[PDB]
Amino acid sequence: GKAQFGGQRFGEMEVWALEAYGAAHTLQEMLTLKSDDIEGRNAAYEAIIKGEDVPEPSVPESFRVLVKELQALALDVQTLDEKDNPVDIFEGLASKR
Amino acid sequence: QLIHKDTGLIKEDEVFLGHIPLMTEDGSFIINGADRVIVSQIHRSPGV
Amino acid sequence: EAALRDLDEEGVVRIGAEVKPGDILVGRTSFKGESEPTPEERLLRSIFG
Amino acid sequence: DQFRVGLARLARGVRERMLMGSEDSLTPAKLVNSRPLEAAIREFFSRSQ
Amino acid sequence: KKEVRKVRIALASPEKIRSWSYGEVEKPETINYRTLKPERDGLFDERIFGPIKDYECACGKYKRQRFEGKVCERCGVEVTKSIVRRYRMGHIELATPAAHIWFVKDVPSKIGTLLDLSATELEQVLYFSKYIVLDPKGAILNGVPVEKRQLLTDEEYRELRYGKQETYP
Amino acid sequence: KARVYPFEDDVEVSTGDRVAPGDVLADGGKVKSDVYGRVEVDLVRNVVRVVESYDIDARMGAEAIQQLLKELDLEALEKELLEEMKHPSRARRAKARKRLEVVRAFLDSGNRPEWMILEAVPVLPPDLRPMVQVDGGRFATSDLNDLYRRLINRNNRLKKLLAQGAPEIIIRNEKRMLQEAVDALLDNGRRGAPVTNPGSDRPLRSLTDILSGKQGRFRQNLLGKRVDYSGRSVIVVGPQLKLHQCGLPKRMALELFKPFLLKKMEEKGIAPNVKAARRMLE
Amino acid sequence: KISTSDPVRQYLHEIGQVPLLTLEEEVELARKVEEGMEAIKKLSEITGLDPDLIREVVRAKILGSARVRHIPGLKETLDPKTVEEIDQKLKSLPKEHKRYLHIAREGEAARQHLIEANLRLVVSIAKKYTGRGLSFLDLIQEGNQGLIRAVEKFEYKRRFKFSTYATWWIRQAINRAIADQARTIRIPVHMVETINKLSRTARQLQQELGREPTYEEIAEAMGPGWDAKRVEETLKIAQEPVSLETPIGDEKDSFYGDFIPDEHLPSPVDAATQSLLSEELEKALSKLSEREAMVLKLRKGLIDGREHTLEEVGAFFGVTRERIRQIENKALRKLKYHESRTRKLRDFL
Ligand SMILES: [Zn+2]
């Protein structure tokens, strides 16, 4: 903002570096909580506030968004598990009727 | 000067619609209050 | 109010003031949430005028 | 040169006037408009690389 | 509450497509300017995409989160986080079928590369605009009876539809 | 080119039907017509011109193609092309395989060719292609809406036209345009390029474009995110520091840990509650 | 040639069109149409079936089968079944009537011809409505429909050229659609009128006045109900607007959007605050006048409109507003001052 700072441009080069080390979580939270995962951060904040541990990372808007773009391009993108069963990344607001 | 086949030589000697910036005593310009500068750039002279 | 000590000049802050990040160079006011006071806030607010 | 572009851009304008231009209800600046040239140069400085 | 381990990518069943759409856009209308309102049946008709105000209908007949997810019997808009507006998808129903380019300009042009069709010459020519191919039947002829599906031109087409006519001033 | 069939006593059909020879024609059955074509009704000599035009089906655009996709058993072509695989040693054997793998993927990973065609166009959630007010009475949006718009426009127009039993020409032509709009949206520029009808003849950022931001070779893509508990400053050397240490401007530090900090505060008399400390530091 | 991205020219093969519509021909065709409809009327009536319905039929058949909408709006009309049913019926009708049939038949067919033959007249017009803000094509097609209408609405009986006639309709459908699809935002026509009306003047003013006249100037200039700040709002409203995908001064990888922030969603801070809020609130709430502590909340706190007294009376399905006044008092009062002890929400405002 004006009286509010912006965030550091965490890029591939930095991703790469991180990866190299193997700090899975960091890189995750790094890009999720610390950045694109909505609900997370808030939940994150609060957690910290109450002096609690940290919740786990969901899907980064970036990606969700992505999925949509695809869909918008008439392209089903399906998250699946081992049993090869679809998984809703929007946990509801995607499932209609 | 606009004339007519009928040798109609009516001359409205005025049209100040447009004004243009001026160069400071030092050589720079004032654009929207901002001191602006113009960089003389080079090129391949016109010839053969 | 102590936050108005200097910016008292009917809107503007009085010239020659030692300002620090967070003070008010200028005071401005508009209307938020399309000027609709939260019902949640509503209650709270009432409890003190 | 920049003066010319918006300049030539005015003549384009002025030539589009002989079309529906009256016998002699066209003489001065009824055939005029700075905006095009105005912009050109203006646009120039202000937004010039 | 659990985790995943496999991502998929498959085309979209118009069904599947429709299986997503929380409605269908029928109207171009963006937003009403006088009040900045998601034009009804338009591109922002929150009736389709949802509340613009988390947990709250249009006409406002419904507000508090104390109406978990009960549709509006009036404005016909649900009640939940307006956030869903950036997630729900609607669709358009095409009066006629339209081809997904990524299966044309991409070579081999999958589809044509699937119909013995010139990744351009054949494919393009037809679909896009000008020429026609014989869909199912073609008994009548010009020497050659038919083409199970081979190409044909307009004049060709009409010289069969209208047979043959001629005006003489 | 038509067969004059004069009639008299009983009646026929309706000047437009395909007949060859059809069950009945005119005059209580005293008339049929082994030959094909379409009916034309004369009302004077009770005669009937029957230009020849057997009923054939030759459609254009998707519909056509679409049909084909449906009308096609892979299980078939599969083993079919399989029979060109080596037989024509090198020539026609090349193409064969090519075309063949496709199928296998389709054939194998359950899908359906028909799918590649469209009649159900998806739409991005609003807040992903928002419309927001900006400056002293103006707003902004994404080209999509626009793309999207024009499209809709076309389709709905189309409807009427059909609903209007109009000259398949303008019709076709229309469809044509529609199709354009179609792809125009999906990926603009892949064939002719549309731009903001007005002003900057710049193309409108289409799906694909927007997507992979391919208009950069996806080599320079805007790859990167912004972190929340980040900060930056110039560096200096700390001879005092011990290998695993590093100097940090309190001030800066402060912000980065605000929350944690806040908590501690509260955790200590000094801070009754949160918002307290919160403002307490503003 | 290849990427012969010029639909224009293609459609422009309207030269292959035989505009040979001599008066004598136009004429002929004309009557042949009216009659065609008049017929339909008889029919429907002489059948108790809907007229539109009829002609709808008449079309398909004449419109050939290679053209039947595979999806008549997805089964609307049973294009392959309910259709013939009608046919054999009409066909199975007496000559006197059945004759009307082939009439409408020819009637529609005729129509078609007429249309096309003047498809170029169309174009010759669209040309003038160019730039205004809409694909030449779209332009064309629109005027095209306006034409058809003109056809429909047309009494040849009154002797006079169709060209000049329909030419009208075309214009309308055009402007019509211009006002419609032109903007990115849906706005009234009368709106448009004036809008242009404005811009136009601007020139006739700027020119004369030598300078850029402002509200006042124009507001006056404009007329009957023209206020400066009015003028003002208009322009604002008459704006284009702007792309989020616009590259920024960086001219490299920045886009307007990269800067628009979101305010509809609470920062983890607020979110937390509110949740945190929602907490102590009811904390106090509970340890209080059961049905009477809930009253206010149950009202706006749960739905809408706390202290709708004259309502809340029957909303409590009992006690009168008179008493309500009281309740509130002690209720709130008793609270806050009690909460002067257990300080909680005291750290808000
Ligand atoms: Zn409602």
From Swiss-Prot, chain A:
Q: What is this protein called?
A: DNA-directed RNA polymerase subunit beta
Q: What is the lineage of its organism?
A: Bacteria, Thermotogati, Deinococcota, Deinococci, Thermales
Q: What does this protein do?
A: DNA-dependent RNA polymerase catalyzes the transcription of DNA into RNA using the four ribonucleoside triphosphates as substrates.
Q: Which gene encodes it?
A: rpoB
Q: What do we know about how this protein assembles, alone or with others?
A: The RNAP catalytic core consists of 2 alpha, 1 beta, 1 beta' and 1 omega subunit. When a sigma factor is associated with the core the holoenzyme is formed, which can initiate transcription.
Question: Which family, according to UniProt?
Answer: Belongs to the RNA polymerase beta chain family.
Name the domain of life this protein comes from: Bacteria
Swiss-Prot record, chain C:
The protein's superkingdom reads Bacteria
The record's note on quaternary structure and interaction partners says:
The RNAP catalytic core consists of 2 alpha, 1 beta, 1 beta' and 1 omega subunit. When a sigma factor is associated with the core the holoenzyme is formed, which can initiate transcription.
**What does the similarity note say?**
Belongs to the RNA polymerase beta chain family.
- What is the stated purpose of this protein? DNA-dependent RNA polymerase catalyzes the transcription of DNA into RNA using the four ribonucleoside triphosphates as substrates.
Q: What is this protein called?
A: DNA-directed RNA polymerase subunit beta
User: In which organism is this protein found?
Assistant: Thermus thermophilus (strain ATCC 27634 / DSM 579 / HB8)
Query: From which lineage does this chain's organism come?
Result: Bacteria, Thermotogati, Deinococcota, Deinococci, Thermales
* Gene that encodes the chain: rpoB
From Swiss-Prot, chain E:
Q: List residues binding Zn(2+) 1.
A: C57, C59, C72, C75
Highest rank taxon of the organism: Bacteria
- Function in brief: DNA-dependent RNA polymerase catalyzes the transcription of DNA into RNA using the four ribonucleoside triphosphates as substrates.
Record text on subunit structure and interactions: The RNAP catalytic core consists of 2 alpha, 1 beta, 1 beta' and 1 omega subunit. When a sigma factor is associated with the core the holoenzyme is formed, which can initiate transcription.
Family of this protein: Belongs to the RNA polymerase beta' chain family.
Q: Supply the name of the protein.
A: DNA-directed RNA polymerase subunit beta'
> Where does this protein come from, organism-wise?
Thermus thermophilus (strain ATCC 27634 / DSM 579 / HB8)
Gene responsible for this protein: rpoC
Q: Which residues of the full protein are shown?
A: 2 to 170 of 1524
